[PDB]
């Protein structure tokens, strides 16, 4: 427990050293992007040792490194939950981040602030590992809010662009609406259990946990971009592509699923929460699959792919399969990061062109990027024995063979075939068809800083699922008995989705003009959810702030009724008593009244 | 040392002298409040061999 504990603590130390060097004058005498990639690379290697010792003996740890402050009968300690979820997420996140950071060197080579960009990515990774290794909610909330701030800074990287700054604040707003639920859970657990520590929270198993579990679900809804709090994730594509590869596809967006995985012992005894997660996930997995079918930005298609896969993770959580939902986080991290890397490879070579309508023929002119793009798409769609198969197929089996809401079941399968359809949309319009880009062709995909990171994630997208699946301890008992049509449902609907999309795409070449039916406009304009909610809601709330709060009350009626009426009264009393004629005759008359009044009071009060 | 130098740097004794004088007045405040020295329930004890007071 000394080698294990040392390894967990050494990973954080290695990731801080790039941050520490940034504060010194040494940063300008070294290749900082290369130094930071090596620090992460070594940190991944160190993280493999605790991964191996867990695969062997399956022992779990609670590690406390620092006592922060005692509030009477509540001790706050920096402590770490080093269990199955934390050990495996650390190894996966460090591996992916190692690819993203090497890729950023090639991708952001022309940015004059590459060093700051590299530093921000490192900080995001530190906050994400604080989030996934925390043993108590307060430490978790540090990582929860940390990644929010780092995503804000990275989304709004090109800060002279108005649209980037709008997308950055949008992510803050939606995740702040989710943070209300996180705080609700925190206050509830400190009052009902006197702890934010997960071990003490486990003795809440028998209680009614509806109020706190509704809080975690709201926090997850915002953080994983589920329906209701969903629009910020596609808008976060404002940031540089390495930001989207790391944060908004592989690591940051699964924090919500991860939170609900941690609290799975409490959600298991609450059918209302399980039902809500199932239906919320199913609505998100369908809604964002519909949106992706008619998108033209390559980064927006992949963004909506992420929201749809997160919805499928939420459906898995709703079926009481926390370990399957976690295993999809790890497998999803590989082929999705590769997809973003390969699109960033294409975007860079075509002079910052992101529209698929000006791509085409990438299968021949960029052979390496195209091959990895197809590998990633086949893993996403559940091609057998690739990384996606070893989690997605079990998810489709579990939903078919369990007591479940029937609309949730149906739209989850419809959204799975729709996954094949929008994957085909990228393959058809980007890799096949004829060139549609400007005639001056200066494509170069030969840098090792581009090819090696993608190649490392292509291997993960082929073998990682198999290796993880056979090493993790047994968890939930799977149902391996079912009719042939339930066992092969995932493969059949995926293949069917390809044929439908492959057919519909060929019809785009016939010389017949396309029209705008009301169903496609819904898909293209994202169900109009942004075009309504992002206009009415800020308008009503911002109008009330000015017209009512500031103007009607603070500038008008709070002035009129307190300071201004006091001023008027005493001015009025001042002018009525000081407007004297200076005539001694009038004063002496008034003194006569004074004398008479004093004599009258004396007389009546005479006993 | 020099009237031009001293006329400029003599002011550097004011605040230090306020501190030393402030400390002196605080010890005089201790002397007026010795009515329960070594007489409280919590702390009273027998005096050590060569001890005149438990605190000063």
């Amino acid at each position: 427990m000394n080698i294990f504990t040392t390894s967990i603590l050494l990973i954080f130390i290695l990731l801080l050293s790039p941050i520490l060097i940034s504060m010194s004058n040494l940063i300008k005498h070294i290749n900082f992007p290369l130094y930071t990639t090596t620090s992460i690379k070594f940190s991944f290697i160190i993280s493999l040792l605790p991964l191996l010792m867990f695969f062997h003996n399956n022992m779990e740890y609670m590690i406390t490194t620092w006592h922060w402050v005692t509030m009477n009968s509540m001790e706050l300690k920096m402590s770490f939950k080093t269990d199955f979820f934390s050990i495996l997420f650390t190894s996966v996140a460090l591996f992916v981040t190692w690819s993203i950071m090497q890729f950023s060197s090639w991708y952001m080579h022309s940015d004059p602030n590459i060093n700051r960009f590299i530093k921000y990515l490192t900080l995001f990774l530190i906050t994400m590992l604080i989030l996934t290794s925390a043993n108590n909610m307060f430490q978790l909330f540090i990582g929860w809010e940390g990644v929010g701030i780092m995503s804000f800074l990275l989304i709004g990287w090109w800060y002279g662009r108005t649209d980037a700054n709008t997308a950055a604040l949008q992510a803050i707003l939606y995740n702040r609406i989710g943070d209300i639920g996180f705080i609700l859970a925190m206050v509830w657990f400190s009052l009902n259990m006197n702890s934010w520590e997960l071990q003490q929270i486990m003795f809440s198993n028998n209680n009614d946990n509806l109020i706190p579990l509704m809080g975690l679900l709201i926090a997850a809804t915002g953080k994983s971009a589920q329906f209701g709090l969903h629009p910020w994730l596609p808008s976060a594509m404002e940031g540089p592509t390495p930001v989207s590869a790391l944060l908004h596809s592989s690591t940051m967006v699964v924090a919500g699923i991860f939170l609900l995985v941690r609290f799975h012992p409490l959600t298991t005894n609450n059918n209302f929460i399980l039902t809500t997660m199932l239906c919320l996930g199913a609505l998100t997995t369908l809604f964002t699959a519909i949106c992706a079918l008619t998108q033209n930005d390559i980064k927006k298609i992949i963004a909506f792919s992420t929201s749809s896969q997160l919805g499928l993770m939420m459906v898995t959580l709703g079926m009481n399969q926390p370990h399957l939902a976690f295993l999809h986080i790890c497998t999803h991290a590989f082929f999705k990061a590769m997809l973003f890397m390969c699109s960033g490879s294409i975007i860079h070579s075509l002079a910052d062109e992101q529209d698929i309508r000006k791509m085409g023929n990438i299968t021949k002119i960029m052979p390496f990027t195209s091959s990895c793009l197809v590998i990633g798409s086949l893993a996403l769609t559940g091609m057998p024995f690739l990384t996606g198969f070893y989690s997605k197929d079990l998810i489709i089996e579990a939903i078919n063979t369990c007591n479940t809401n029937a609309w949730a079941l149906l739209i989850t399968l419809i959204a799975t075939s729709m996954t094949a359809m929008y994957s085909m949309r990228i393959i058809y319009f980007v890799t096949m068809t004829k060139p549609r880009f400007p005639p001056l062709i200066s494509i170069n995909e030969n840098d090792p800083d581009l090819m090696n990171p993608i190649k490392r994630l292509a291997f993960g997208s082929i073998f990682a699922g198999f290796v993880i699946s056979y090493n993790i301890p047994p968890t939930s008992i799977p149902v391996l008995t079912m009719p042939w049509f339930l066992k092969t449902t995932a493969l059949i609907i995926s293949v069917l989705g390809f044929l439908i999309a492959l057919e519909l795409n060929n019809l785009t070449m016939k010389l017949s003009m396309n029209k705008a039916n009301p169903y496609s406009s819904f898909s293209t304009l994202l169900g109009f959810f942004p075009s309504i909610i992002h206009r009415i809601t800020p308008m009503k709330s911002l109008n009330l702030s000015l017209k009512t709060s500031l103007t009607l009350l603070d500038l008008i009626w709070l002035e009129k009724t307190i300071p201004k009426s006091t001023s008027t009264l005493h001015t009025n009393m001042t002018t009525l008593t000081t407007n004297q004629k200076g005539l001694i005759k009038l004063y002496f008359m008034s003194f006569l009244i004074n004398i008479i009044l004093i004599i009258i009071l004396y007389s009546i009060n005479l006993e | 040392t020099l009237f031009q130098l001293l006329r400029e740097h003599w002011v550097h004794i004011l605040v230090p002298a306020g501190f030393v004088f402030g400390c002196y007045l605080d010890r005089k405040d201790d002397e007026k409040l010795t009515a329960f020295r070594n007489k409280s329930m919590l702390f009273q004890r027998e005096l050590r061999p060569n001890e005149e007071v438990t605190w000063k």
Binding site: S531, R535, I536, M539 | -
Partner: protein, 62 residues
């Protein structure tokens, strides 16, 4: 068919009947408006390009 304007989704200029009006009363207003804009632009630019300016440009409208 037809587009129905709303306060948060306004009428396009191309669909606005007042954009296709060519009456000399309107064209005189449009020319008068540009004369105001052009004079204001000239005053701003003379301050902006003046090589002896040492401070920012005061903005009476703000």
């Amino acid at each position: 068919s037809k587009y129905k304007p709303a306060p948060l989704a306004t009428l396009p200029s191309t669909l606005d009947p007042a954009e296709y009006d060519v009456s000399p009363e309107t064209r005189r207003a449009q020319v008068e408006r540009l004369s105001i804009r052009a004079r204001l632009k000239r005053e701003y630019l003379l301050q902006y390009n003046d090589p002896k300016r040492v401070s920012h440009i005061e903005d009476p409208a703000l």
